[PDB]
Amino acid sequence: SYPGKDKNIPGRIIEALEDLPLSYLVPKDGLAALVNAPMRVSLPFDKTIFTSADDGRDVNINVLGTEKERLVFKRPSNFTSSANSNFLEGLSPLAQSVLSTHKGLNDSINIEKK
Amino acid sequence: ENLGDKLSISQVYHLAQEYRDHAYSIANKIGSEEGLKQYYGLMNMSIQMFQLLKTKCTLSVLEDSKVTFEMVELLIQETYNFDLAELYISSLKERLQTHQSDTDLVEEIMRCEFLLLHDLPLMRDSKFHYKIALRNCNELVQYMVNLQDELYQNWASVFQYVGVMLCIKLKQHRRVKTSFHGLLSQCREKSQWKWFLNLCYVNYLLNERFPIPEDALQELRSTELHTVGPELYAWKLALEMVIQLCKDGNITDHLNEFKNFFDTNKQSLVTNEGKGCVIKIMPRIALKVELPMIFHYKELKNILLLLQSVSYIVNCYDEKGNFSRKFLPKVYSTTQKLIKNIAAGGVSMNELDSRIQTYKSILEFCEFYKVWEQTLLKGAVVTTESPKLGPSPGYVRLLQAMKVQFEGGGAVEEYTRLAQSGGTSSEVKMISLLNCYTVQAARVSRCSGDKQGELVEQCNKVWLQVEKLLQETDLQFNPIWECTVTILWLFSHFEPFSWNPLPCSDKQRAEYVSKLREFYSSNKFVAADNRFKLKKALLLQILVNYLGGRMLEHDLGEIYAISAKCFDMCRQQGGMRKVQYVIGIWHLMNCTVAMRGKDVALTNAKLEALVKQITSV
Amino acid sequence: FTSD
């Protein structure tokens, strides 16, 4: 003969748990994968070429239009800097010209999938 | 006056190298849709330059190689032209194989296979291609072991590892476990190679929650710092830490070995930061390993704290959980400082892109384990916002099913659906199954016989899915898990814990009751040191002592001290009132029997106020 | 504890 006996309250421990999820079981799903990823295993190829200035070969780099290919670049998931605060400065002069020259091919294409 | 269009060959090639390496310096500076076309402009140029040298020049076999490689590296890391990059690598290979008997071309030819069988199929991420890469990678290995030279035995071991890494991607988990052992069994003992491959095995099992076989566990403990070097060793330490956190063990010894390590090797991870780990298997067989979270000193302490913080989640109420409510947000800021201050390079923008994406997942773990610490301490799901997938499969619809069970809604629908779909981890499958068996067993007791024929039916199913997913995972060695299995069997197969206890043999009672004694004898309010001790989980400790005090205690002063305690504990976390009540009836008997007069009076008032609240509006 |  105890209080609320007559009421509709659980009387046995298994019943007290119907609206109690075993929340002391904290899931660790994914934490090991956080150690293990991202992971790169790569193979260096450390060998110089075109050090011998002895080279009488020379090239006329007027690329652009001239098998098959049509390169498509990867739309990255994040910007790598936040916009809350031009990138050719530092290029050597030969380089900067070639880029002004072939400004037409810098009509690339960025897309995404896998 | 200078030329710009009839250049030496070394100038053409050094211009491809400059356009690339300039992109590698503005990679962490892209903030706009514009700046992206600048970055990929500099890469477009570098790729088409390397193509010029290949078509408009005559190159030696070594120049075709170092050039074709440098170009393919960019096709692979910057475009989706995987079919194309595979053309260049197969052509370069087929050429090198014409000269291969009058010139030494093994390093180049192996490096080609590595691109066809490892680097490319991973970036592709296509089950069809993986299935082909493996066909080929096996054909390669099965062919090289028939060459007795010491080089070809070491390269087969390299492609035996490429063979495994693919099976993991193809989720052919038996092949994975079989090969990893055949590979490790052949590697020269106590070698940095075997110890790296082994670190890969252990970490593979943890990702699938598979139980870690004994030899591998000793191989991990026996890793020597001076044969494996501070990068691979900080990985060995990370794995042991994670092994404890998984069996809910104690991590004090581990956080201290990490401190002994850090006191003598911190500069190795800061000064050497960037240069990676190189595993010299042989003269001219050296593999580079980059593990960014584990190898760079700052990045490691941030991971390492989130683990220390996930262990103390269950302590929550008033001590070690004060460590978690203090240090989970610092993970979030120190993780946020690693994103704002990300620096190139000189790696792809997309390398830095994915290292950001891992940092963004670490952010989502924190916004989760705060919602969990809020559901322990308060007995309800804060649910909140929406636009998150949960840092794992359906941690959202687990959190959302729990919010249904909390609301008395049963959630038998949600927990079966969550444990039915193949995408969910094996652990979350189990948490969903136990909560099911708990709700189904609760009904067998508190339901009539009309609904019970169907509900005795369900309780049997759901119990065996639990017998299963427990026996094939590493949870079977987590004491908090084995004990919760005991608690629930006894509660459902014994009166007065179920109104309609489920049938069982005398032998099965002898089993489980003898179990509970080991747990009870070792966790009862008289604390020791062994494999049966439990983290101070409140709900768990309370049920262990109600259950255990009620079945194994015979003295009456003893039984009064215990029920007095259990009863007072229940206030420590929210959402406990209906358990506090069933405990107070129990204390109320023990008081009346022991004639503790006043106690029978107070406990009546305490139970009157609980009935008032349990039936509130 | 807690470095920088």
Author numbering:
A (entry chain B): 2 to 67, 80 to 98, 105 to 133
B (entry chain A): 2 to 528, 533 to 622
C (entry chain E): 3 to 6
Publication excerpt:
We show that phosphorylation of the Ctf19 kinetochore protein by a conserved kinase, DDK, provides a binding site for the Scc2/4 cohesin loading complex, thereby directing cohesin loading to centromeres. We have shown previously that Scc2 recruitment to centromeres requires a conserved surface on the Scc4 protein (Hinshaw et al., 2015).
Iterative density modification with non-crystallographic symmetry averaging revealed extra density near the Scc4 conserved patch, allowing us to model key Ctf19 residues, including the conserved F3 and the phosphorylated T4 and S5 residues. The phosphorylated Ctf19 residues T4 and S5 make electrostatic contacts with lysine side chains protruding from the Scc4 surface required for centromere cohesion (Scc4 K331 and K267). Coordination of these phosphates traps Ctf19 F3 between two aromatic side chains deep within the Scc4 conserved pocket (Scc4 F328 and F263). The structure also explains why the scc4-m3, scc4-m35, and scc4-m7 alleles abrogate Scc2 targeting to centromeres (Hinshaw et al., 2015). The conserved residues F324 and K331 are mutated in all three alleles. Y298 helps coordinate the phosphate at Ctf19 S5, and K299 makes contact with the Ctf19 peptide backbone, explaining the contribution of these residues to the scc4-m7 allele. We found that Ctf191–6 phosphorylated at amino acid residues T4 and S5 bound Scc21–181-Scc4 in vitro, while an unphosphorylated peptide did not.
